Amino acid sequence: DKVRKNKDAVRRPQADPALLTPRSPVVTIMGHVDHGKTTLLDKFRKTQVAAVETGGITQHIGAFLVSLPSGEKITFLDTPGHAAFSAMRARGAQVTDIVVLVVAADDGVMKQTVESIQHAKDAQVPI
Amino acid sequence: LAEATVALAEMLELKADPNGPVEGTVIESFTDKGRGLVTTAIIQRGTLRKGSVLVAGKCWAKVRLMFDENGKTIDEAYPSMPVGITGWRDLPSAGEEILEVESEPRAREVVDWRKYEQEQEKGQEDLKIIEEKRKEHKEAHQKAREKYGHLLWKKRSILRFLERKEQIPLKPKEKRERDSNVLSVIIKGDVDGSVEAILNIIDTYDASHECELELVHFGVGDVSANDVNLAETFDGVIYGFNVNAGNVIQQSAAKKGVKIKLHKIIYRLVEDLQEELSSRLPCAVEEHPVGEASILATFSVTEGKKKVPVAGCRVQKGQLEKQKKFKLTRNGHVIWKGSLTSLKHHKDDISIVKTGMDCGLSLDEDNMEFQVGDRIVCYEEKQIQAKTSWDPGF
Amino acid sequence: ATLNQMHRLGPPKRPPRKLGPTEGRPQLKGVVLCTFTRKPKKPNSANRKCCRVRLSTGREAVCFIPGEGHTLQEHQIVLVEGGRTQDLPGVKLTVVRGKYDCGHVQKK
RNA sequence: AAUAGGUUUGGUCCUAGCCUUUCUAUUAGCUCUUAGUAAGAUUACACAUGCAAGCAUCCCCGUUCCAGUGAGUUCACCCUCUAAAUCACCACGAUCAAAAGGGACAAGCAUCAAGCACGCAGCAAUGCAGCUCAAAACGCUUAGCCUAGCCACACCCCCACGGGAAACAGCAGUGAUUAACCUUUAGCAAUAAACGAAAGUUUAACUAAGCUAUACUAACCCCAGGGUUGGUCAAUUUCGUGCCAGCCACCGCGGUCACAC
Ligand SMILES: Nc1nc2c(ncn2[C@@H]2O[C@H](COP(=O)(O)OP(=O)(O)OP(=O)(O)O)[C@@H](O)[C@H]2O)c(=O)[nH]1
Ligand SMILES: *C(=O)[C@H](CCSC)NC=O
Ligand SMILES: [K+]
Ligand SMILES: [K+]
Ligand SMILES: [K+]
Ligand SMILES: [K+]
Ligand SMILES: [K+]
Ligand SMILES: [K+]
Ligand SMILES: [K+]
Ligand SMILES: [Mg+2]
Ligand SMILES: [Mg+2]
Numbered sequence: 099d100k101v102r103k104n105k106d107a108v109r110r111p112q113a114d115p116a117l118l119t120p121r122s123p124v125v126t127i128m129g130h131v132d133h134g135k136t137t138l139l140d141k142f143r144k145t146q147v148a149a150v151e152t153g154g155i156t157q158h159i160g161a162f163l164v165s166l167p168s169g170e171k172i173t174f175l176d177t178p179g180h181a182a183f184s185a186m187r188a189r190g191a192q193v194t195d196i197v198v199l200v201v202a203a204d205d206g207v208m209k210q211t212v213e214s215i216q217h218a219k220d221a222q223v224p225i
Numbered sequence: 226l227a228e229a230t231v232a233l234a235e236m237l238e239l240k241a242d243p244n245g246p247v248e249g250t251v252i253e254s255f256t257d258k259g260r261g262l263v264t265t266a267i268i269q270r271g272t273l274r275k276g277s278v279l280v281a282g283k284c285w286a287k288v289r290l291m292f293d294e295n296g297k298t299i300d301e302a303y304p305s306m307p308v309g310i311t312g313w314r315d316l317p318s319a320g321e322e323i324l325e326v327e328s329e330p331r332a333r334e335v336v337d338w339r340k341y342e343q344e345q346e347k348g349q350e351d352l353k354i355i356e357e358k359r360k361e362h363k364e365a366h367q368k369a370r371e372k373y374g375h376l377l378w379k380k381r382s383i384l385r386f387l388e389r390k391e392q393i394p395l396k397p398k399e400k401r402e403r404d405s406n407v408l409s410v411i412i413k414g415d416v417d418g419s420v421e422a423i424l425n426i427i428d429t430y431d432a433s434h435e436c437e438l439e440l441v442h443f444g445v446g447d448v449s450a451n452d453v454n455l456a457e458t459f460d461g462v463i464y465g466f467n468v469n470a471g472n473v474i475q476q477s478a479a480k481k482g483v484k485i486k487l488h489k490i491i492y493r494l495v496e497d498l499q500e501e502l503s504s505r506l507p508c509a510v511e512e513h514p515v516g517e518a519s520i521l522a523t524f525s526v527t528e529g530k531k532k533v534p535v536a537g538c539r540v541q542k543g544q545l546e547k548q549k550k551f552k553l554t555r556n557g558h559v560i561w562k563g564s565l566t567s568l569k570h571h572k573d574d575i576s577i578v579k580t581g582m583d584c585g586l587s588l589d590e591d592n593m594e595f596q597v598g599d600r601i602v603c604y605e606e607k608q609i610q611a612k613t614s615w616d617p618g619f
Numbered sequence: 620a621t622l623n624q625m626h627r628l629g630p631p632k633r634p635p636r637k638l639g640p641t642e643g644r645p646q647l648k649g650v651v652l653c654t655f656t657r658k659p660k661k662p663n664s665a666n667r668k669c670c671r672v673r674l675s676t677g678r679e680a681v682c683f684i685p686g687e688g689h690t691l692q693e694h695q696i697v698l699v700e701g702g703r704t705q706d707l708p709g710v711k712l713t714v715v716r717g718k719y720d721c722g723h724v725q726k727k
Numbered sequence: 728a729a730u731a732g733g734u735u736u737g738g739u740c741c742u743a744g745c746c747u748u749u750c751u752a753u754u755a756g757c758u759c760u761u762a763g764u765a766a767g768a769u770u771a772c773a774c775a776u777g778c779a780a781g782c783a784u785c786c787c788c789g790u791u792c793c794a795g796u797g798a799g800u801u802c803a804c805c806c807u808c809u810a811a812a813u814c815a816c817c818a819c820g821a822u823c824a825a826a827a828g829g830g831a832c833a834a835g836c837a838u839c840a841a842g843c844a845c846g847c848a849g850c851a852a853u854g855c856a857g858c859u860c861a862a863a864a865c866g867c868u869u870a871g872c873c874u875a876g877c878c879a880c881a882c883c884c885c886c887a888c889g890g891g892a893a894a895c896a897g898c899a900g901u902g903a904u905u906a907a908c909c910u911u912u913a914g915c916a917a918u919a920a921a922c923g924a925a926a927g928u929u930u931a932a933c934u935a936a937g938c939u940a941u942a943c944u945a946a947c948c949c950c951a952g953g954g955u956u957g958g959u960c961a962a963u964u965u966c967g968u969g970c971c972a973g974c975c976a977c978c979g980c981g982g983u984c985a986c987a988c
């Protein structure tokens with residue numbers, strides 16, 4: 099049996115009920131291009147970043163630890179809406195607990211809105 | 226919406242053990258010049274502190290600095306917290322799970338076992354390719370050997386010498402010229418997720434027949450000398466995405482002839498990528514019909530001791546011009562393609578014959594046979610800029 | 620030579636030892652450009668797998684891939700080392716198996 | 728080059744080169760139990776952050792030291808003379824030691840052979856026409872050295888008024904780059920330095936720890952791998968391949984009996 103011994107580090111088994119302590123939710127703002135994802139995030143972040151961007155397009159996934167007025171803390175993952183960043187949207191859906199789908203009323207459902215919904219179904223996260 | 230989000234989260238009853246080896250996921254990974262290799266991550270189990278040894282795929286780290294979105298150091302990262310982590314000995318891929326290990330030698334042991342597994346998976350893939358190359362060669366070897374029987378090798382070389390006296394092969398240059406329609410690109414990006422996005426767009430290229438897109442090297446960070454050297458080696462083009470190139474790097478590219486193309490928007494960098502592909506494409510000639518004339522009588526003229534066949538033609542629709550190219554048409558078939566050697570009308574050379582003008586037509590090709598009913602269609606050829614067929618979906 | 624002749628000249632000056640393709644360095648890093656084959660000089664007959672790589676120094680040399688079979692393609696990264704290939708004239712560099720893209724020869 | 732060996736030829740002798748056996752140091756691959764000690768960026772490329780020089784009844788002193796690096800490179804040694812400095816102080820001489828003067832001092836290339844004002848006398852005016860060099864002048868390239876250590880540099884322009892311009896060749900750490908990859912520890916308890924009349928304070932010097940088969944020392948109930956196996960050169964069973972695939976430091980092997988793959 100001259101085979102390399104397995105020395106990998108694996109994920110710990112699911113936490114025991116006793117150990118489990120309540121934690122903050124992770125939320126992702128998913129949607130189509132120029133449907134207001136960043137503008138919505140800014141109002142809760144209380145900071146304006148939309149104007150301070152190249153072309154006003156979100157090309158990165160950023161996690162911000164917002165503190166709600168009630169005293170709760172939420173982590174907002176602002177995903178890009180452009181078609182190029184399909185991988186970024188899938189990765190956001192895999193670490194999120196809730197998906198806030200921003201569907202603009204004027205335009206409605208779009209190609210990337212359906213894609214955002216599909217990623218949520220695969221991750222099985224409430225929308 | 227804020228109330229609805231809070232309500233649903235409470236219904237979900239989210240809970241995570243806050244103690245024990247840290248678990249997490251990488252959200253972004255990038256290179257900082259001052260802070261080094263940095264990965265933004267979200268904690269999922271346990272609490273992260275300075276000095277925690279972390280493994281993520283083929284990269285491990287010992288937490289040196291923990292900072293928040295604003296850069297302020299944080300002492301602890303409880304579950305479901307965003308936290309930039311420094312101290313990575315290699316750059317983790319985006320989306321890779323993070324696990325905490327007891328010590329640095331244990332981390333290196335874990336990484337050494339993940340690299341080995343990757344090498345075995347590549348090795349098995351390589352084996353099928355090699356077995357294919359080695360099976361083909363063994364057939365060509367058994368065939369040429371079995372050309373003659375299992376006779377003494379001295380005879381086979383002598384019998385082959387008989388057919389070696391009939392053999393004259395030419396060796397092809399070991400280094401062959403890259404064809405004009407080949408675009409080599411170096412992709413450099415600010416963050417790893419941005420680079421993967423551009424690489425997925427380069428995997429949606431379907432017009433390889435007209436022009437080929439080669440990816441020489443991809444990486445994260447500013448343009449470097451190696452990128453300029455790799456671009457000069459393969460005559461490639463460096464595309465920067467939200468990255469900078471210094472005067473030393475930009476000046477070096479001028480001497481080496483490399484083209485650095487720094488962009489900041491992904492639709493801009495793709496449009497420019499398509500403009501370079503279009504340039505490589507071959508110029509699409511546009512054929513515009515100029516005139517049409519039907520032959521009537523064929524004459525044999527003796528000039529300079531040479532018999533010149535002359536096609537007498539009547540221009541029906543349009544006009545014929547000496548410069549514009551011609552083609553011969555036989556009952557719908559295309560017999561010839563070329564230019565007239567001599568255009569002469571009524572013993573006078575006329576460059577442009579109008580509709581209804583009689584003109585004798587002699588071709589430069591003597592093998593062309595002129596009948597009573599042949600047709601000739603003149604045309605003007607204009608090269609037209611050809612655009613790449615590849616569309617990226619946006 | 621006489622003692623007076625030996626005094627004028629002086630200690631024998633050892634010719635400066637020449638450097639090889641590695642520039643006096645153990646190994647070097649290079650990028651694969653081509654992947655061809657070469658035939659040995661008489662009396663050996665074979666097709667030997669070689670590759671033209673551009674080193675980090677800037678030069679572009681021909682290297683020999685040892686072992687049975689390989690999957691080296693253009694743009695890959697390989698670590699070269701010294702060691703002449705006796706059959707092949709002008710081949711002075713050898714690719715390091717098990718380093719960078721190049722992988723160990725699969726068993727059997 | 729040694730106690731030597733192998734290899735020129737059809738063969739012998741002679742000569743001669745290449746290689747082998749020895750010992751180290753990097754790096755690579757495969758592999759790896761512990762303990763203690765030593766040593767520990769590839770790069771004079773660019774540097775986030777934090778710390779690294781204070782003391783003290785106000786003046787002064789100190790931060791010109793240590794620590795660091797190796798770009799450049801005959802300022803380092805001896806003699807003469809003689810400042811600053813210590814010996815509380817005037818004085819004394821001693822000690823230490825710069826500048827100045829004399830001497831000495833790397834390697835390669837002569838396909839660098841001539842340099843071009845490099846000398847003397849005289850109080851001065853000024854006069855004479857010399858001076859160095861095939862025993863290597865002038866010059867070019869390379870390099871830190873002669874190691875209780877020393878020299879030199881201190882982002883660059885030898886220098887630093889000035890300018891470019893905005894400096895980790897201080898510790899830790901990073902980016903780029905390279906075959907080359909140490910912790911963004913603690914404490915002033917010991918020694919050293921600074922300040923102070925002093926108790927004392929300070930110090931990323933240092934001490935004590937951390938990482939790492941680089942090296943040495945020691946050990947272990949369990950726990951061994953790596954490379955060799957034609958000769959040189961210690962040591963191969965049986966298959967498979969069939970001048971193919973592949974191998975060797977050298978000579979060489981493989982064409983259906985391969986101690987060489
Ligand atoms: N009138 C109006 N304009 C809005 C509203 N929400 C957003 N916008 C505008 O829509 C545009 C796009 O806003 P962004 O915040 O960039 O939208 P996004 O969906 O995050 O964009 P990507 O990141 O490119 O996908 C901006 O000009 C906003 O001012 C709204 O409720 N009303
Ligand atoms: C030749 O001269 C040409 C022949 C026409 S046959 C109908 N006519 C005029 O130039
Ligand atoms: K936009
Ligand atoms: K042979
Ligand atoms: K030096
Ligand atoms: K200087
Ligand atoms: K002390
Ligand atoms: K004082
Ligand atoms: K056999
Ligand atoms: Mg946005
Ligand atoms: Mg040989």
Ligand SMILES: [Mg+2]
């Ligand atoms: Mg012989």
Ligand SMILES: [Mg+2]
């Ligand atoms: Mg000999």
Ligand SMILES: [Mg+2]
């Ligand atoms: Mg010193």
Ligand SMILES: [Mg+2]
């Ligand atoms: Mg004195």
Ligand SMILES: [Mg+2]
Binds near residue numbers: 825826
């Ligand atoms: Mg002196």
Ligand SMILES: [Mg+2]
Binds near residue numbers: 838
């Ligand atoms: Mg010459």
Ligand SMILES: [Mg+2]
Binds near residue numbers: 870
């Ligand atoms: Mg030097």
Ligand SMILES: [Mg+2]
């Ligand atoms: Mg200076």
Ligand SMILES: [Mg+2]
């Ligand atoms: Mg510096």
Ligand SMILES: [Mg+2]
Binds near residue numbers: 895
């Ligand atoms: Mg440092």
Ligand SMILES: [Mg+2]
């Ligand atoms: Mg680094």
Ligand SMILES: [Mg+2]
């Ligand atoms: Mg080392």
Ligand SMILES: [Mg+2]
């Ligand atoms: Mg301290």
Ligand SMILES: [Mg+2]
């Ligand atoms: Mg220590």
Ligand SMILES: [Mg+2]
């Ligand atoms: Mg080793």
Ligand SMILES: [Mg+2]
């Ligand atoms: Mg064998």
